[PDB]
Structure 1
């Protein structure tokens, strides 16, 4: 006796037959089940939640409550002993540019966001959580182990607030706690346009019927747009430099300014919307502002889909690409398009691809000024370095000419993220994204490593020797077993990322299976998938086949030279060609119509 009932706060829209464009919320995509893939609903559960009390309390909440007869290890102790390293020499990916990392974060932000519970401000709560490190309600602090240097320097804990959950986000109900996905499950450019009607309207220029997105009125980049500023206070981007006082950008996704290169990629995408709207207006002078905005939005969504499925996923999944994501055969309205709770952890493989520095390069691909290269941690919520230090071109040149970090069993997550993370309202460059990922796995009720191995038809190692064989690494398996005591208790984020990479890929078997299944479902379960008959025309699909990140750069910067294959390692000048050489997006098939 089902009860798909619950989903309380409700962006409840009824669905119009033969409606020509996506909703902003993702409602009405699936005709039979219109909430499927819509924002502000529960993450899908591919397996039942696993909580200390079967309902809502994370493993690790109650010190004396074991998981399978063993205490779960402190998130920070796993971080310190397994995830950390000192030496950045030799850690770079010799065949992935920095754009490979950056596109991952972009796609991730299109697909999923499980924000911390509201509780608001004006409350003795997250203040107390930060101050006194007392576990209670939504305060689930990351406690330092006795030997942790941060115990000496930073107090007894890293504050950590539990993720929001659907129906109530205060009291609770008699099924398990289900965390919210606040963005649309569809790969639909929700990170540009918003997943909520109010934000989507606020992002638009509704003054002119030109179908444009709002742009910064305070600063321009050699005549090219910046995103608008978010004028909400306090601003973490003002906080990190109170002399410069440059606010965060406002985008479709709340996280756009988290680091300077995310903000950079957001800037490219916004510019591309306005370039498309202007061109469609020239082609189609009688199209109104709503029509121009929707047609540009639809093209930019197809661009994101094609870059992702054609260029990115093959070099993530390598040999597993054909196993999990066969050639597209059409829309299947029986496929669940919802992002799963586990996927939101599987996609954090990107955290091990983030290198320790960011470079700005000039028109000659040489160092931009006397501090061309900067430590990553100085660039969290850093917008002033864009406006006041050369705009986005030097940063885009670095995305092309510099490399991603290569995942390494001995060098997993750079100290820029593992020790120097900045979080809004928490003042210090002193947080640990790895420990946060582990604590969040437990927050979200994640089944352990072997449950997911089973889910993926893979062996479930029970002993040291079994884990050493799966990981192909004796020392890492010994460190895992000393902390976790059974592979059944290994948190999915660390167990998935501990596996050796598949041939031609950048994730191991378990991740290839969880990522592949999810990407297959968001493609096959999307009625507005670019290649679905009647979404675009035959002639439009032919034009769309020629999109490239290189053309996106040529069209929306003053960069003269780009590589043809932007995700691989490219060196200047050898691998860089003139922009005039790069295929263009031919918009002539968007002519209203012809004869």
Structure 2
């Protein structure tokens, strides 16, 4: 039996098929298979799921059951031994701005989201997990190893809930557990507009026929818009400062307020949509709000597509860019547009690019007041520092003039993320992203490192000397072998990130292959790809080729000096030009005359 039966919690719809606009859900992109790429379906499997019991139990569940006759090391143990480091001196990427890091998380959030199992909506199951560290059902807690400082200070574990899976009521037959992607697999600005019709409607300005996205009515950034507040309570953004009591933002994506630079980016994108809609109302005063919303949405979509493929991927993939993403040859309806389970771990390379501090800079790119530089951990679920402390302009200057962290085999993930992460359900700056990433690899039935090396046509190291040669690093290979005993058991997230970077890139070979193939598919398999003939006119495409992140800032802030190349390391003033010398988006080719 072959089964494409099971996928229950989804909006059902007849496909228009002649619409010039994407659906919100991602449905109807592929005409032969309308649900391919749509939200709230299984992540694609490039390799079959690997579970302790072949169905659903992750490796490390049953203390006793081995992986290939070896115990899997505790997620927190791998983190402590390998992923941690003390000295932030010298850690920064000398040719990547903070914008590099930040764009990664933006693209990631557009493509995939595997939300944790709910069921704990006013729940004692939450209690049995957080308080008593009791493994069972969806509680798969991260146990602290012996000697862990957090033993003395937090408890025996970090609580952890397993990712949502298709059929919370399956098809009754007997298959491996498959995690849901709650967002559209297409690069379509879903993190702005929503992947769900109901939310997408609530986000819109339906009071005026002007195709605008709803803006905050309680607060402004010197006349420029903020996202509306999420009024769902209790609010983690209120909790981190109950005096200020500034809630999280309401965005097309649940995660928009996770950290202040991500919230900033979401603000930049919402502003660009409203500016697009107003400029298109000027050109085409006969266009209704629906037409305005879709045409702006359609441009903003291509903008993300263009920045990602022209500016971002080449400086991630380096020498491997052309190998995996050759020049476009048009829409191929046989290409799987869906995001793979493994992709959602490969792209978490970004967690090694986040540095320990965030700066606010003034109009001369100097420290903005006495508390300019803040530790990252103070900025998780932090909206009050935007609303109540200078708006987004000072944070955007930091995005341009400050640097991403470089991935370092000895300095992988800053303590701000490894020890002081805040989760929106919980009350402590006490969680470990690197431990959560390793736990999540097991939750999702990820094959091992050598499985993936194999998939990518790379040598599979089986011995100490073998791993040393792949990693070009004797000590890291050793620490790995002592923890995992065989490279076969190395969880894909630490495995891929352990590899030294390709020439001119910021990931190693295994990650370049996994990311390369996914981005080749998200392009080739996308009927509404901006370069697909008929999606835009040839002239609209000439206009679009001129977009830049620098211009988005010029058009949606009060910053007047910006670099030409916003992703490379730029110092003020040598590398900054006045905004008037930056190419604009010419919207004249969107003019629509009935005569």
Please list the CA deviations of residues 543-586 of structure 1 after superposition, one character each: whole Å capped at 9, or x if unmatched. Answer: 00000000000000000100000000000000000000000000
Please list the CA deviations of residues 432-457 of structure 1 after superposition, one character each: whole Å capped at 9, or x if unmatched. Answer: 00000000000000000000000000
Cα deviation, residue 121, structure 1: 1.8
Aligned partners of 1:99 and 1:567 also within 8 Å: yes
Q: Evaluate the alpha carbon distance shift between residue 164 and residue 424 of structure 1 in structure 2; reply closer, same or farther with a 3 A threshold.
A: same
Q: Evaluate the alpha carbon distance shift between residue 173 and residue 354 of structure 1 in structure 2; reply closer, same or farther with a 3 A threshold.
A: farther
Q: Evaluate the alpha carbon distance shift between residue 556 and residue 173 of structure 1 in structure 2; reply closer, same or farther with a 3 A threshold.
A: farther
Cα deviation, residue 170, structure 1: 8.4
Please list the CA deviations of residues 135-179 of structure 1 after superposition, one character each: whole Å capped at 9, or x if unmatched. Answer: 000000000001111111111000000000011268976100000
Q: Secondary structure at the match of 1:132?
A: coil
Q: Structure 1 stretches (4+) deviating beyond 4 angstroms?
A: 169-173
Aligned partners of 2:6 and 2:171 also within 8 Å: no
Please list the CA deviations of residues 342-401 of structure 1 after superposition, one character each: whole Å capped at 9, or x if unmatched. Answer: 000000000000000000000111100001000000000000000111000000000000
Q: Distance in 2 between matches of 1:127 and 1:528?
A: 46
Which range moved further: 304-313 or 121-130?
A: 121-130
Cα deviation, residue 124, structure 1: 1.2
Q: Distance in 2 between matches of 1:411 and 1:560?
A: 36
Which range moved further: 123-132 or 177-186?
A: 123-132
Aligned partners of 2:204 and 2:213 also within 8 Å: yes
Corresponding residue for residue 456 of structure 2? 456
Cα deviation, residue 488, structure 1: 0.2
Cα deviation, residue 425, structure 1: 2.2
Aligned partners of 1:335 and 1:524 also within 8 Å: yes
Tell me the C-alpha RMSD between the 2 structures.
1.0
* Count of aligned pairs: 595
Cα deviation, residue 10, structure 1: 2.9
TM-score by length of 1: 0.99
Q: Evaluate the alpha carbon distance shift between residue 212 and residue 45 of structure 1 in structure 2; reply closer, same or farther with a 3 A threshold.
A: same
Q: Distance in 2 between matches of 1:363 and 1:335?
A: 47
Aligned partners of 2:324 and 2:516 also within 8 Å: yes
Q: Distance in 1 between matches of 2:96 and 2:102?
A: 11
Q: Secondary structure at the match of 1:318?
A: helix
> What 5-or-longer segments of structure 2 have no aligned partner?
none
Q: Secondary structure at the match of 2:131?
A: helix
Aligned partners of 1:456 and 1:510 also within 8 Å: yes
Corresponding residue for residue 301 of structure 2? 301
Cα deviation, residue 227, structure 1: 0.3
> What 5-or-longer segments of structure 1 have no aligned partner?
none
Aligned partners of 2:120 and 2:126 also within 8 Å: no
Cα deviation, residue 467, structure 1: 0.2
Aligned partners of 2:5 and 2:171 also within 8 Å: no
Q: Distance in 1 between matches of 2:8 and 2:380?
A: 35
Aligned partners of 2:105 and 2:262 also within 8 Å: yes
Cα deviation, residue 128, structure 1: 1.4
Aligned partners of 1:117 and 1:169 also within 8 Å: no
Aligned partners of 1:501 and 1:507 also within 8 Å: yes
Aligned partners of 1:393 and 1:558 also within 8 Å: yes
Please list the CA deviations of residues 100-138 of structure 1 after superposition, one character each: whole Å capped at 9, or x if unmatched. Answer: 000000000000000001213232101210000010000
Q: Secondary structure at the match of 1:533?
A: coil
Please list the CA deviations of residues 176-204 of structure 1 after superposition, one character each: whole Å capped at 9, or x if unmatched. Answer: 00000000000000000000001100100
Q: Secondary structure at the match of 2:220?
A: coil
Cα deviation, residue 593, structure 1: 3.7
TM-score by length of 2: 0.99
Q: Distance in 2 between matches of 1:193 and 1:150?
A: 39
Please list the CA deviations of residues 454-486 of structure 1 after superposition, one character each: whole Å capped at 9, or x if unmatched. Answer: 000000000000000000000000000000000
Aligned partners of 1:59 and 1:442 also within 8 Å: yes
Corresponding residue for residue 419 of structure 2? 419
Aligned partners of 1:142 and 1:159 also within 8 Å: yes
Q: Evaluate the alpha carbon distance shift between residue 478 and residue 104 of structure 1 in structure 2; reply closer, same or farther with a 3 A threshold.
A: same
Aligned partners of 2:17 and 2:31 also within 8 Å: no
Q: Distance in 2 between matches of 1:194 and 1:378?
A: 28
Q: Distance in 2 between matches of 1:249 and 1:265?
A: 12
Aligned partners of 1:142 and 1:435 also within 8 Å: yes
Q: Distance in 2 between matches of 1:160 and 1:90?
A: 33
Cα deviation, residue 9, structure 1: 2.2
Q: Secondary structure at the match of 1:584?
A: coil
Cα deviation, residue 17, structure 1: 2.8
Corresponding residue for residue 8 of structure 2? 8
Aligned partners of 1:335 and 1:521 also within 8 Å: yes
Aligned partners of 1:273 and 1:300 also within 8 Å: yes
Q: Distance in 2 between matches of 1:43 and 1:3?
A: 15
Q: Secondary structure at the match of 1:93?
A: strand
Q: Distance in 1 between matches of 2:169 and 2:188?
A: 27
Q: Distance in 2 between matches of 1:57 and 1:120?
A: 20
Aligned partners of 1:448 and 1:488 also within 8 Å: yes
Please list the CA deviations of residues 49-80 of structure 1 after superposition, one character each: whole Å capped at 9, or x if unmatched. Answer: 00000000000000100000100000000000
Q: Distance in 1 between matches of 2:471 and 2:96?
A: 23
Q: Distance in 2 between matches of 1:169 and 1:515?
A: 32
Aligned partners of 2:17 and 2:28 also within 8 Å: no
Q: Evaluate the alpha carbon distance shift between residue 352 and residue 172 of structure 1 in structure 2; reply closer, same or farther with a 3 A threshold.
A: farther
Q: Distance in 2 between matches of 1:397 and 1:169?
A: 49
Which range moved further: 179-188 or 147-156?
A: 147-156
